[PDB]
């Protein structure tokens, strides 16, 4: 029903509640052209709640396991990076630098320069 | 998120409404590829017009910041504020700076050459 017509923020909410990475892999299988608009909705909606990194971890697992490549995850990285509840580094900056490696882009410099 | 937006809009206002652009440059501060912007302004030579924002973000102590202020002073031929600036940060060489000053025709400024 959703992709048919909806603001899929609610769908995310279902996801960010129903912790089912396999359900992501269902959502995330790249043959859906509408996979782009929905991820464009998640790149801001998923961050709204920000209570505990459970679904965060789960969705980044889904990303790396479905191999969500550069240009896709680093979005998540930087957005959760800047001034969130999470100023800690639970593999956060670490996968950040890993993506920096998989990216090899000048951005890495200032990323360091903000990293601690 | 994506930033090409910024470049397009600024190129426009540059071309159309720089009076309406300056302010915006300030408003778009936090997340920025500042150095690419300053390279672009070098290309457009109108960095002296965007000087306010420059003096604003002066804090971050980047090579770009340095060279910007330096050439602005060269063109400007100021020393007092130049003294302040050069003392404010360190992330830049001074050899070429000494080369500039050694013929500055102004021992007052060549005094600063000796200082550095």
Which method resolved this structure? cryo-EM
Q: Are B26 and B56 in contact (CB under 8 A)?
A: yes
Instruction: Supply the Cα-derived Rg of chain B in whole angstroms.
Output: 16
3-class state of residue A98 by DSSP: helix
In a 10 Å sphere around its CB, with 0-12 CB exposed, 13-18 middle and 19+ buried, how is residue A62 labelled? buried
CA neighbours closer than 13 Å in the CB half-sphere of residue B1? 15
How many angstroms separate the Cα of B53 from the Cα of each of A8, B16, B98?
39, 19, 27
Spatial contact of B61 and B91, defined as CB atoms under 8 Å apart: yes
Q: CB distance from A82 to chain B under 8 Å?
A: yes
Subunit contact B1:A75, Cβ cutoff 8 A: yes
Q: What are the distances in angstroms from CA B108 to CA B89, B98, B113?
A: 21, 13, 9
Closest Cα of chain A to B77: distance in Å?
31
**In angstroms, what separates the C-alpha of B78 from chain A's closest C-alpha?**
30
Residue position matching structure tokens 């001034």: A83
Q: Do B30 and A79 touch (CB under 8 A)?
A: no
Beta carbons of B1 and A82 less than 8 Å apart: no
Helices B107-115, B95-102: crossing angle, 10 deg rounding: 160
Cα torsion B70, B72, B77, B78: sign: negative
Residue A75 to residue B31, Cβ atoms within 8 A: no
- The answer to whether the Cβ–Cβ distance between B31 and A82 falls below 8 Å is yes
Sign of CA dihedral B40, B41, B43, B44: positive
A-B contacts (CB, under 8 Å): 7
> Touching check for A109 and chain B: CB below 8 Å?
no
- Token pair 């956060």 is found at A92
Q: Closest residue of B to A106, CA-based?
A: B33
**In contact, B2 and B32? CB cutoff 8 Å:** no
């Amino acid at each position: 029903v959703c992709n048919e017509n909806s603001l899929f923020k609610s769908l995310s909410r279902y996801l960010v509640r129903r912790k089912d990475p396999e359900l992501w892999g269902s959502v995330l299988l790249e043959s859906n052209p509408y996979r782009r608009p929905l991820i464009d909705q998640v790149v801001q909606t998923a961050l709204s709640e920000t209570q505990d990194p459970e679904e965060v971890s789960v969705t980044v697992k889904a990303f790396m396991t479905a191999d969500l490549p550069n240009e896709l995850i680093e979005l998540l990285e930087k957005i959760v990076l800047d001034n969130s509840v999470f100023s800690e580094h639970r593999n956060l900056q670490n996968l950040l630098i890993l993506t920096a490696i998989k990216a090899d882009r000048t951005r890495v410099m200032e990323y360091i320069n903000r990293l601690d | 998120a994506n930033v090409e937006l910024y470049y397009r809009a600024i190129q426009f206002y540059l071309e159309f409404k720089p009076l309406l652009l300056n302010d915006l440059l300030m408003v778009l501060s936090p997340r920025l590829d500042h150095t690419r912007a300053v390279n672009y302004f070098s290309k457009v030579k109108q960095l002296p017009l965007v000087k306010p924002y420059l003096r604003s973000v002066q804090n971050h102590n980047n090579k770009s910041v340095n060279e910007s202020l330096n050439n602005l002073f060269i063109t400007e031929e100021d020393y007092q504020a130049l003294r302040t600036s050069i003392d404010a940060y360190d992330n830049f060489d001074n050899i070429s700076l000494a080369q500039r000053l050694e013929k500055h025709e102004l021992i007052e400024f060549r005094r600063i050459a000796a200082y550095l």
